[PDB]
């Protein structure tokens, strides 16, 4: 009952307008959005464990000093509400539209905004991160391949399965890399910009759910998926990461199948359909 949660918040934080306040819901978490603050309320007592999990990931990422904002716990985890709640900062800024990011007058600025963040992520103390974050597992793509063949291959054309087998294989073939912080989903929607004296500034990165000690190529793949090779070539040039192109393409070739598999597993029909379109005719 969002009524109770509303009272929980007003009681704990009297001065926080919940009229015209966002709400995300799922069988796991309720989230009230406000001007400067996000309130997360777990639904089960097991899902309560997500709260210190989120605090631990965000604190470890903050400690790397990326030079851009990440969500900040604004409160201790509290055992108020049904199964606890956590107050996080709300970051300001908007994703860069593909059109905006690529203009000749801003493309170099955008490339360096991505580069300075990715550079800081690659320079993270991995021994510290490895204690808190998930660590890329050598069996990850093997296992992912298994679940795609079991769950999605039946829904595909023969041409679909051939294409999917090549894309799965390129990922399974990659040698294991765990050398820095990886966001794991660094598409445009999770990267927030403001016009600062009439040029873009990357001010925030949100949604660290897939954060891990892993392969820097995975974040470059995601930037490529959102903004195209013109931008990623400039980021790679700046980083001196020309070595990574095969790995970047291997990650990018799994993105439609990742979305399809999640659509099947999450029971989202539109994600399943959208993910599979290149892998069948009808």
């Amino acid at each position: 009952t969002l009524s109770h949660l509303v009272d929980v918040v007003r009681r704990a934080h009297p001065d926080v307008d919940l009229e015209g306040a966002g709400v995300h819901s799922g069988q796991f978490h309720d989230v009230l959005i406000a001007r400067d603050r996000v309130f997360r309320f777990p639904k089960t007592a097991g899902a309560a464990a997500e709260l210190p999990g989120r605090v631990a990931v965000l604190t470890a990422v903050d400690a790397v000093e990326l030079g851009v904002g990440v969500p900040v716990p604004l409160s201790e985890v509290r055992d108020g509400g049904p199964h606890g709640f956590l107050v996080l900062s709300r970051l300001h800024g908007t994703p860069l539209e593909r059109g905006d990011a690529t203009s000749p007058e801003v493309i170099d600025v955008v490339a360096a905004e991505f580069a300075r963040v990715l550079r800081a992520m690659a320079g993270a103390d991995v021994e510290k991160l490895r204690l808190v974050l998930p660590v890329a597992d050598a069996g990850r793509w093997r296992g992912f391949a298994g679940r795609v063949r079991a769950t999605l291959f039946p829904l595909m054309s023969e041409d679909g399965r051939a294409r999917a087998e090549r894309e799965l294989a390129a990922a399974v073939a990659m040698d294991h890399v765990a050398t820095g912080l990886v966001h794991g989903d660094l598409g445009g929607e999770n990267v927030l910009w403001q016009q600062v004296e009439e040029l873009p500034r990357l001010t925030g990165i949100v949604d660290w759910d897939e954060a891990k000690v892993g392969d820097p190529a995975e974040d470059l793949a995601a930037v490529g998926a959102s903004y195209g090779p013109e931008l990623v070539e400039r980021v790679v040039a700046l980083l001196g990461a020309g070595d990574l192109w095969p790995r970047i393409r291997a990650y990018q070739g799994t993105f439609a199948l990742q979305q399809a598999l999640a659509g099947a597993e999450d029971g989202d029909d539109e994600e399943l359909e959208d993910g599979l379109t290149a892998y069948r005719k009808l």
């Binding site: 598409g187 998926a225 990742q258 993910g275």
Partner: peptide, 6 residues
């Protein structure tokens, strides 16, 4: 979700 990975 969504093509980037979600």
């Amino acid at each position: 979700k969504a093509x980037r990975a979600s």
